[PDB]
Subunit: 351 residues, 2 copies
């Protein structure tokens, strides 16, 4: 939260780091992929270049160039003539957030990021064009390569998934009858509800394609006779929302829409409902994080929406989201937050 | 230099490393869109609104850059107005950072994505993002305008532009003829020919390259005394012209495999007398007085891997020295820290 001066004129080094981000990223990806961080992991004493070479079956050249570049980046150290894992390498190896983000940035983002410039300029996801010509990554998804899909789904899960105690005990503090979950195409949330309260009925809204997976994924889970799908297109027209729901829920949904789109979806939400029903918006807000690293990540992430999938959209700053809510005719009745990996929840109501 | 440096904020680095490409593009545009500039104006800093208007960026387009940069740390927040930070300044005003950034976007960005295959297959798999000459050297004249600008800038900035020390190291032996291998801009030869009034300099490089150097050295002071010698430094078969009491290679040669180096250096060993001195001038990362320099040079080697040969690099000196000794020479003297971190090795047969 700093954002108020952090570096001696060793800020000069940061510039250079920034300037070499592409190389650094790539070299660390491979240090990992080729199994060198792992190799170093299991030998405190470390290994020589000829040794790393031998074990990994990489040219001496190939290994020297990665190892040298990592030595100065600082993911490994040099002792006598052996390279040893440094702490930063250990995290690349072991931190699930880093592995997720890195894999994501390679398979989904790397190439398209070249075209971020025109993406900012034009107001659409110009990077997506290196895969195809869909309006959004959402629509083109079923068509991206294996690996690209793999990494995207990992990203989508790592930042969405969770648990859901805090959240659960809050929403049900109002003993609701029918929760309408807009966009939870996995059913994990509705699963939790169902298995938490024994007569709530949950209706998930989403594109039909997406609800075939929810039924797949949710197949023979412990309360699923009470989980219902309702196909929709979430497009200004009728896309009116079902009605008679005591709860309405939206999680990691809608950081993938414009503000303009977000206010439209909400106003249309603000019609489903009576002055009795609560509206819950759960989101990863970059400005409201426990850990600064979390803030850093979320704001770097925002750019994938810009390059791939734009016409939108970003990890919200709480102020904007709160502004967007109040214009849909709703009011935040409290922003309890900091649940799971730093997911804030906004309990709103009508009026 | 090397011994553990980070708290367990090794964890943040892992993430910084993970987001390199985002960090890079975001910061590249904060330059291009002139947002660092605008910010280096009013010390007070500007507001987000003021910033979209001033730039013509959507505001979304602008928020998104500002927010990423805020956390990167290149700018800095005051109430509701952004200020430029020290790191933004270095990007704004430091020439090295600008050369690299521009080099990496225009020349390397897209191709690095194939670094894996290049490291596996031992050629520059990245180059195919533009064409597929064997090498970046044979495709230079064919890359996009902007790519050419950025490569030449890189090429210029990592060369000796000082010369002072080099001149005295070299002319302290009164060479009558100097053979300059790869000196295709003619810049070094111009210095020699204007330093001493009798020396005659011969540049060795591909015939086209030499057309360029006659262009470049056109109408300069010593040029009647600068000659070209058309060769395929590769052709392990053609011998080097002889009769030269100084042979010179500077920032050339880190463009060759160790193999090729030794090949090149043996052919040299066989052109010279016992009294001939041979100078190799490189930017050697292990000999740098400033850590930042080492850092860059080690990262700069991967442009070679992905984009150029797919098999050369910025040398660790132990390797340059080994190579030298296999070619059958020996290093007598070793001066470094010249200019932005150059070293010159003075060698001779034996």
């Amino acid at each position: 939260y700093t954002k108020e001066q952090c570096t001696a004129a060793e800020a000069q080094r940061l510039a250079q780091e920034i300037a070499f981000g592409p190389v650094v990223f790539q070299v660390s990806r491979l240090m990992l992929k080729f199994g060198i961080f792992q190799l170093l992991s299991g030998k405190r004493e470390g290994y020589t270049l000829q040794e790393i070479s031998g074990r990994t079956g990489l040219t001496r050249y190939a290994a020297q160039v990665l190892l040298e570049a990592s030595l100065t980046i600082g993911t490994i150290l040099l002792e006598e003539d052996r390279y040893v894992l440094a702490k930063a390498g250990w995290f690349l190896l072991n931190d699930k957030m880093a592995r997720v983000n890195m894999e994501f940035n390679h398979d989904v983002n790397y190439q398209g990021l070249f075209h971020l410039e025109e993406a900012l300029l034009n107001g659409r996801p110009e990077g997506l064009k290196v895969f195809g010509e869909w309006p959004t990554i959402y629509e083109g998804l079923s068509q991206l390569p294996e690996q690209v899909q793999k990494s995207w789904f990992g990203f989508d899960h790592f930042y969405s998934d969770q648990s859901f105690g805090k959240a659960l005990e809050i929403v049900f503090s109002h003993h609701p009858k029918r929760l309408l979950d807009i966009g939870g195409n996995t059913g994990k949330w509705a699963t939790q509800c169902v298995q938490y309260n024994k007569e709530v009925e949950v209706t998930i809204v989403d594109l039909p394609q997406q609800l075939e997976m929810m039924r797949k994924q949710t197949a023979g889970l412990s309360g699923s006779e009470r989980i219902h799908g309702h196909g929709a297109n979430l497009l200004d027209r009728d896309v009116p929302f079902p009605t008679g729901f005591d709860a309405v829920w939206m999680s990691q949904f809608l950081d993938c829409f414009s503000e303009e789109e977000v206010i439209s979806i909400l106003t249309r939400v603000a019609q489903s409902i009576g002055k009795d029903s609560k509206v819950y918006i759960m989101e990863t807000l970059w400005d409201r994080q426990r850990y600064e690293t979390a803030s850093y990540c979320l704001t770097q992430i925002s750019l994938y929406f810009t390059a791939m999938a734009n016409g939108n959209s970003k990890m919200f700053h709480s102020d904007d989201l709160i502004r967007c809510i109040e214009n849909a005719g709703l009011e935040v009745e409290e922003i309890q937050d900091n649940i799971g990996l730093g997911h804030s929840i906004l309990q709103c109501r009508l009026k």
